[PDB]
Amino acid sequence: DRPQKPFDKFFIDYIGPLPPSQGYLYVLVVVDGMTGFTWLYPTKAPSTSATVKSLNVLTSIAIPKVIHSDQGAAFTSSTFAEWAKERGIHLEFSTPYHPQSSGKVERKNSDIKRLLTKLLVGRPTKWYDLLPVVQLALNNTYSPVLKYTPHQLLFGIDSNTPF
Amino acid sequence: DRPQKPFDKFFIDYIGPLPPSQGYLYVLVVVDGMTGFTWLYPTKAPSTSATVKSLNVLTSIAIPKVIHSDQGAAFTSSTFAEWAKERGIHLEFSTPYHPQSSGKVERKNSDIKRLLTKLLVGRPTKWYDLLPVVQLALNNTYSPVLKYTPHQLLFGIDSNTPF
Amino acid sequence: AELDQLLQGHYIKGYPKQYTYFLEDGKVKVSRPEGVKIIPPQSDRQKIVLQAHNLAHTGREATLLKIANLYWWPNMRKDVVKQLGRCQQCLITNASNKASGPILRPDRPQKPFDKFFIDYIGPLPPSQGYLYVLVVVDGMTGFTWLYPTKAPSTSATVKSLNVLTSIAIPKVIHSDQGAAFTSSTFAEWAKERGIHLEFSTPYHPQSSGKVERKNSDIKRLLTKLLVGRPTKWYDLLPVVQLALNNTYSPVLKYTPHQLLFGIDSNTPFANQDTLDLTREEELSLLQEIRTSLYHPSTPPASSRSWSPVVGQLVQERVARPASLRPRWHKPSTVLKVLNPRTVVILDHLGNNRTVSIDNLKPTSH
Amino acid sequence: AELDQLLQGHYIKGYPKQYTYFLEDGKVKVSRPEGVKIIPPQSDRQKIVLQAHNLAHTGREATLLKIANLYWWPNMRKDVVKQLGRCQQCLITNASNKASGPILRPDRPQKPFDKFFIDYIGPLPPSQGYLYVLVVVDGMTGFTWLYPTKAPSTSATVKSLNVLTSIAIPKVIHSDQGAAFTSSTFAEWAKERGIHLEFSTPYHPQSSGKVERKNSDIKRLLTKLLVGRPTKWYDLLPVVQLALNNTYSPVLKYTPHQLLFGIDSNTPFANQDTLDLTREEELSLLQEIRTSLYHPSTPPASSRSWSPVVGQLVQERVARPASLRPRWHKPSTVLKVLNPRTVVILDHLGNNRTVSIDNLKPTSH
DNA sequence: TACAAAATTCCATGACA
DNA sequence: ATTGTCATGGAATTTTGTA
DNA sequence: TACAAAATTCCATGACA
DNA sequence: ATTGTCATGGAATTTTGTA
Ligand SMILES: [Zn+2]
Ligand SMILES: [Zn+2]
């Protein structure tokens, strides 16, 4: 009803498996519905557990009202269901096979995979150390609509590392 | 020239040898010329050394202008002579054989030996522990002249242990 | 139940009319200047305050600001304060924001030997096998005896004071409640000689202030002599003792020695003013000096001080507080007020403790 | 030589006539109200003052009272003060009696991420193998990140801040000169990312005051949650972090989170005042909030404060002073006054040190 | 009945636990 | 059941030598 | 245009090193 | 080269509901 805001919705997805870096295989991807801000967490499995351990990190900063995801076994589990009921997060699922996000999220989530591939090649074994440099680049990347970096929309100032 | 005062003169003498108490054999005796106050220190020998070690204890409280003694080997030594020149104490010696004190000191120094004997007998091995009780009794003992205890003349108040 | 009448526009004590009270989602709501707030029912309100508080156990104002986001009701703070008073955890953990009233300046003892103050310094660097110094100050004169010891033990305290009381016997010996003096062996040694033992409230060195202050000077002088040299303090004690007993207090304009004896011994720069008086004239000039001495008065109370009332709720500081555990004990009642700075409390739970207010805080709320 | 003329009754500048100056024992003497005092010759006077002083290294007044027993001469104190100024020992041992001037309240950083303050808490009781907490506070917002570590090591600081700077990169990180941050490995990590390192003057935690103050609250809350329970703090850090970042400062009337993000997340009692504004209206209402924040000013100077002049003689407090050794270093010159509370000194001897005046005293005399 | 400087007193500051 | 203390050295105040 | 009480602000106090 | 901070809960002050 009212205008879209940060923390209204968090779109989550798993990327992988990738060539093992530092004993990790997967990247959990969390994009903010409204701003396009992106968190990335390396996991060892697309398991409920790995998701919860990861999302405990994120929810020490901020808790979303809604998490949107596909019907992946990890997110459909009742452990994950209970986790989110505790923190008072509403869970929301896309249809099987027809996985829909925001127009802006689809755009963003595509950017990530391509950016990951470009920088995987050449150093496929060493992608772990790069996740911060990646995360930083995405969030300070100019959006064709609004011409605001996700950073700017989240914090309401300019960053000290532009691109 | 001017009226007699505390710390003007210290009369010193050795009593002994006595039956060994706590490995001690001698009592060094220091009486104040003016007040009759008495210090007693147990020594192991009537040596210069034992005297100096003992008198270092006394001179942390007060230093006399003059020390009077007989021509005992301990006090005629040049070590003792140097000790007293340092602290700026004048040494004064009685004639050999004709040992003179103050009228009051002779009186007092006699009291000590008799008091020591009365309390030696019965517990001749245990006189060390008693030296304080002795010292206390002497100094709070009424003088026929002045009717002031040595304590009173030294401190200018009454003691908390009268006799 | 009581919020029925309100929606209809009937007045209720505490609910300001002029604001319209309406209904949505089966919750009672109100339009207020600040915004539109939910008014919870009576029974729900304690539950709410508690939840808000428990987020990070915040005080009055912090806890309210949370609540006031969603809710409104009459006299909100009153309810908040009620909880903060019953929070076991905040009570025993939060610090005080009220300082104790102004200190007392107990009258200087009248005569020398009326009162001795005693304490151990150390441990120090081992000198000649000795580690501690027993320090004994005469209350009246500030005269001081020093005895090197190997332990702050009753045993050694007794050895040392036996030599001391060969000079004279005090009426009262005042010490801290350190093991060396609170032993039953010491009490007896003391009883035998007719000496009354007297102890500072626990963990309050200010009460032993006369010794403690003298501890400072002993150390400061030792320090000055030991510059350059290795720390051979054993041989120095006597010199220090003597040096200190013969130093002027610029306020008194007298040395401890002078106050004790009434004439200077044969020390350097010995005062000769009373050289013509008989000992007797001198000894009464002394009594005159001793009663005329400067005596300090108590300072003004700070803006936000407190003082102990009988029956007040009160909390004692945890003595040796373990890492991450509360800095205060549970609440205690004041039983008697021995003086404006000393108190008897019914404790944990419950014995009588005598404590300084410096180790106390008023339970708030 | 100069005291010849005097006995004859001829005037000398500084020797008040009306008192008769006579001779005894081949010393010049004078009858004064106080009594009859020996007047030593010029050359002997330094020797005298020194002897009097050295008895127990006493100050002006104490040292004079000794001397004035036996002697008199013109402007006695002037001579005493001259010695006390040249006493190596008193200088480096005596405490100060002048307090440092009023503290500065440095302007709050303008934007979030302008400045980070960082510090380690601990050691704590071992929880899950961890002993220390790295604490990171954003200067502007007071937002705080917590990271459990096994050591206050550069190694672990880097690991932890790599996760942190995935969110954003600060301009400036301010820390104390603890080994973990003064390492060359840290300087490089920082250089790579274009972060300026900035250090507090040595042994002055007040400069890291923002973190240090936050250290307090972290500990106080952990404490409250851990009452009754054993000290399992590892699992609690997140909750604490979150709880604290979302707590109101009654002075600001905002939570760190709010200042950082400009809206509340989905936490309990989340504020809804800006629910109708577009993100854009909101984001500028935020910029308005951030510049309007309460900023404290410096307090009045105490009666007896001092402030550093260029070329002043000045002494730095001995950092970890050994038992019985001087609490102060030898004298140092002030080189530049970086601000009324910070100073560059030419030291021991001699490098440039940048120090807080709280670790300074004015060499007296 | 008065002045400049010395001599004395005042007293905040800090350290002992 | 008990209780703060006092050296120190600039500054403030009072006394002093001389008129 | 004025009141009593509530709501808000003030701010000394203490603890982080 | 750099620099104190701020929760807390009585008290003091200002605002509020009603007249
Ligand atoms: Zn609480
Ligand atoms: Zn000196």
Contact between D334 and D309 under an 8 Å Cβ cutoff? The reply is yes
Helix (H) / strand (E) element for C147: namely strand C144-149
Q: Looking at the structure, do residues C287 and C328 belong to the same domain, yes or no?
A: no
What count of Cα atoms within 13 Å lies in the side-chain half-sphere of residue B104? 21
Please report, as a single letter, which amino acid is at residue B154: L
Beta carbons within 8 Å of C8's beta carbon, 6+ residues apart: none
Contacts of A8 (CB under 8 A, 6+ apart): A33, A34, A64, A65, A66
CA distances, C122 to each of A152, C162, C181, C319, C362 (Å): 61, 22, 16, 20, 34
- Nearest Cα to Cα of residue C236 among C245, C228, C246, C226: C226
Check whether residue D283 and residue D264 sit in a common domain.
yes
Q: Which chain B residues are closer than 8 Å to C167 by Cβ?
A: 61, 135
For residue D163, with 0-12 CB atoms within 10 Å meaning exposed, 13-18 middle and 19 or more buried, which class applies? middle
- The continuous run of DSSP H or E covering C137 comes out as strand C132-138
Q: Which nucleotide is nearest to C338 (CA to C1')?
A: F2
Chain centre to alpha carbon of residue A154: 15
D141: left (phi over 0), alpha (psi -120 to 50) or beta: alpha
CB D175 within 8 A of CB D116: no
Q: Where are the beta strands (DSSP E) in C161-290?
A: 172-175, 196-199
Report the alpha-carbon distance of residue C337 to residue D48 in Å, rounded: 55
Q: Using only the alpha carbons of chain A, give its radius of gyration.
A: 16
Residue D318 is classified by DSSP as: P
Distance A94 CA to F7 C1' (A): 81
CB-CB contact of D194 with A160 (8 Å): yes
Question: Can you give the resolution of this entry in Å?
Answer: 3.2
Pairing mode, strands D313-316 and D360-362: antiparallel
Residues C221 and C262 in one domain: no
Residue type, C350: G
Q: Which of D68, D95, D122 is the last residue of a domain?
A: D95
User: Structural domain tally of chain C?
Assistant: 4
E strand or H helix at B35: none
D65, D136, D152, D187 from D174: Cα distances, Å: 52, 10, 16, 12
Give the side-chain half-sphere CA count within 13 A for C307.
12
Nearest to C89 among D227, D249, D272 (CB): D227
Enumerate residues 6+ apart whose C-beta is below 8 A from D131. D122, D123, D124, D149, D150, D151
Centroid of chain to Cα C117: 18
Please provide residue A53's backbone torsions phi and psi, each rounded to the nearest 5 degrees: -55, -50
Question: Which pair of tokens denotes residue B154?
Answer: 């030294």
Residue D86 CA to its chain's centroid (Å) = 27
- B42 three-state secondary structure: strand
Residue D268 and residue D234 share a domain: no
Which nucleotide does the CA of D32 lie closest to, via C1'? F16
- The tokens of D335 are what? 């080189």
Residue A6 main-chain phi, psi, to 5 deg: -60, 140
Same domain, C224 and C265: no
Angle between helices C209-226 and C237-245 (to 10 degrees): 120
- The contacts of residue D41 (CB under 8 Å, 6+ apart) are D1, D2, D3, D28
CATH number, domain containing residue C347: 2.30.30.140
Instruction: Report whether D235 contacts D241 (CB < 8 A).
Output: no
Assigned domain for C20 exists: yes
3-state secondary structure of C199: strand
Strand E contacting residues by CB (7 Å): C 119, 121, 205-206, 209, 212-213, 215-216, 219, 250-251, 253; D 61, 64, 74-78, 95-100, 302-305, 327
3-class DSSP state for residue D17?
coil
Q: Is the dihedral of CA D51, D56, D62, D68 positive or negative?
A: negative
Beta carbons within 8 Å of B71's beta carbon, 6+ residues apart: B93, B94, B96
A48: CATH: 3.30.420.10
Please state, as a whole number, how many other Cβ atoms lie within 10 Å of the Cβ of residue B136: 21
Ligand closest to CA D91: 2
Alpha carbons C286 and B59: distance in angstroms, whole number: 23
Phi (first) and psi of residue C58, to 5 degrees: -85, 160
Q: Order of strands, edge to edge, in the sheet holding C172-175?
A: C144-149, C132-138, C115-121, C172-175, C196-199
Tell me if C180 sits within 8 A of C152, measured CB to CB: yes
**Are the C-beta atoms of A141 and A111 separated by less than 8 Å?**
yes
Nearest to C15 by CA among C154, C24, C32: C32
Chain Cα centroid distance, residue C280: 44
Q: Are B135 and B146 in contact (CB under 8 A)?
A: no
Cβ distance of C220 and D61 shorter than 8 Å:
no
* Claim to verify: residue C273 and residue C338 sit in the same structural domain: no
Residues making up the binding site of D for Mg(2+): 114, 176
Instruction: Answer positive or negative: Cα dihedral of C68, C74, C78, C79.
Output: negative
CATH number at residue D274: 6.10.20.110
Q: Could you give the 3-state DSSP secondary structure of residue D232?
A: coil
3-state secondary structure of C250: coil
| Domain end among C247, C267, C282 | C247
CA C77 remoteness from chain centre: 33
DSSP state of C201: P
Measured in angstroms, how far is the CA atom of residue C59 from the centroid of ligand 1?
8
Distance, in Å, from the CA atom of B46 to the CA atom of B52, rounded to the nearest integer, reads 11
Residue entry with tokens 């409390």 = C345
Structural tokens at position D82: 């001259």
Backbone angles phi, psi at D339, to 5 degrees: -175, 170
Q: Which ligand is nearest to the CA of C52?
A: 1
Structural tokens at position D178: 């603890």
**Do residues A59 and A67 lie in contact, with contact meaning Cβ atoms separated by under 8 Å?**
no
**D150, D229: one domain:** yes
Which residues 6+ apart lie within 8 Å of D36 measured at CB? Answer: D29, D30
CB burial readout B20-45, b (16+ within 10 A) else e: ebeebbbbbbbbbbbbbbbbbbbbee
Question: Residues C213, C329: one domain?
Answer: no
DSSP string computed for chain A = -PPP-TTSEEEEEEE---S-BTTB-EEEEEEETTT--EEEEEESSS-HHHHHHHHHHHTTT---SEEEE---HHHHSHHHHHHHHHTTPEEEEPPSS-----HHHHHHHHHHHHHHHHHHTT-TT--TTTHHHHHHHHHTSPPTTTT--HHHHHHSS--SS--
Q: What does the alpha-carbon distance between residue D15 and residue D21 come to, in Å, rounded to a whole number?
A: 10
Query: Which of A9, A13, A6, A37 lies closest to A113, judged by CA?
Result: A13
Ligand 2 center from residue D51 Cα (angstroms): 10
* Residue-number span of the structural domain to which D137 is assigned: 114-247
Structural domain including B5 reads 1-163
Question: What positions of strand E are covered by protein, i.e. any atom < 7 Å from a CB?
Answer: 6-17
Angstrom distance (rounded) from CA C244 to CA C246: 5
Using CA atoms, how far residue D76 sits from C252, D39, D42, D79, in Å, is 21, 11, 12, 5
Q: Which amino acid is at B89?
A: I
Could you tell me the two tokens for A72? Answer: 């992946």
Separation CA C173–CA C144 (nearest Å): 13
C124 with C239, same domain: the answer is yes
Reduced to 3 states (helix: H, G, I; strand: E, B; else coil), residue C45 is helix
Q: Is residue C310 included in any domain, yes or no?
A: yes
Interaxial angle between packed helices C76-86 and C60-70, expressed in degrees from 0 to 180 and rounded to the nearest 10:
130
Q: Phi first, then psi: what are they for A21, rounded to 5°?
A: -115, 125
Residue D276, C-beta contacts closer than 8 angstroms, at least 6 positions apart: A2, A3
C215 & C317 share domain: no
- The answer to whether residues D321 and C220 touch, using CB atoms and an 8 Å cutoff, is no
Q: How far apart are CA D155 and CA B57, in angstroms?
A: 60
Q: Tokens representing A159?
A: 């960053």
Residues 6+ apart with CB under 8 A from B149: B139, B140, B141, B142, B143, B159, B162
Shared-domain flag, residues D236 and D277: no
Cα separation, A40 vs A54, whole angstroms = 9
Q: Distance (Å) from CA D300 to C1' H1?
A: 27
Return the amino acid letter for D304: R
Residue with tokens 């005159």: C288
Q: Does residue D76 share a domain with residue D29? A: yes
Q: Which residues of C touch D325 (CB under 8 A)?
A: 223, 226-227, 231
H helix intervals, D165-314: 179-182, 184-193, 209-226, 237-245, 256-261, 279-291
Chain-centroid distance of CA D62 in Å reads 31
Of all residues in chain D, the one with the smallest CA distance to A137 is D166
**What's the sign of the alpha-carbon dihedral C241, C245, C246, C252?**
positive
Helix/strand/coil for D339 = strand
Is C108 inside a domain boundary?
no
Answer yes or no: do C227 and D51 touch at CB < 8 A: no
Q: From CA B128, how far away is CA B109, in angstroms rounded?
A: 19
Closest ligand by atom to C87 CA? 1
- Tell me the one-letter amino acid at D306: W
Residue D165: name the closest of D142, D136, D141, D130 by CA: D136
Give the whole-angstrom CA distance, residue D223 versus residue D232: 11
Residue tagged 């024992």 (tokens): D25
Give the Cβ contact number of residue D179 at 10 Å.
Answer: 10
Structure determined via: X-ray
Sign of torsion, CA B154 B158 B160 B162?
A: positive
Size of interface C-D (CB pairs under 8 A): 136
Structure tokens at C320: 């040796």
Whether the Cβ atoms of residue B68 and residue B80 lie closer than 8 Å to each other: no
Distance, CA of D167 to CA of A135 (rounded, Å): 7
CATH number of the domain that residue D240 is part of? 3.30.420.10
Number of domains into which chain B is organized: 1
The answer to whether residues B44 and B25 touch, using CB atoms and an 8 Å cutoff, is yes
Position C109 in a domain: no
Residue C295 CA to residue C106 CA, distance in Å, equals 9
Q: Pick from D275, D265, D335, D339: which is nearest to D107 by CA? A: D339
Rounded to 5°, angle at Cα D17 from D16 and D21: 100
The whole-angstrom distance between residue B140's C-alpha and the CA centroid of its chain comes to: 15
Closest residue, chain D, to A87 (C-alpha): D267
Residue whose structure tokens are 């309460």: D294
Distance CA C123, CA C126 (A): 8
- Of D64, D95, D126, the position where a domain reaches its end is D95
8 A C-beta contact, residue D112 and residue D138:
yes
C119 annotated as ligand-binding: no
- Any chains having at least 3 CB pairs less than 8 A from chain D are A, C
Other beta carbons less than 10 A from residue C323's beta carbon: 11
Q: How would you classify residue D212: left for phi > 0, otherwise alpha for psi between -120 and 50, otherwise beta?
A: alpha
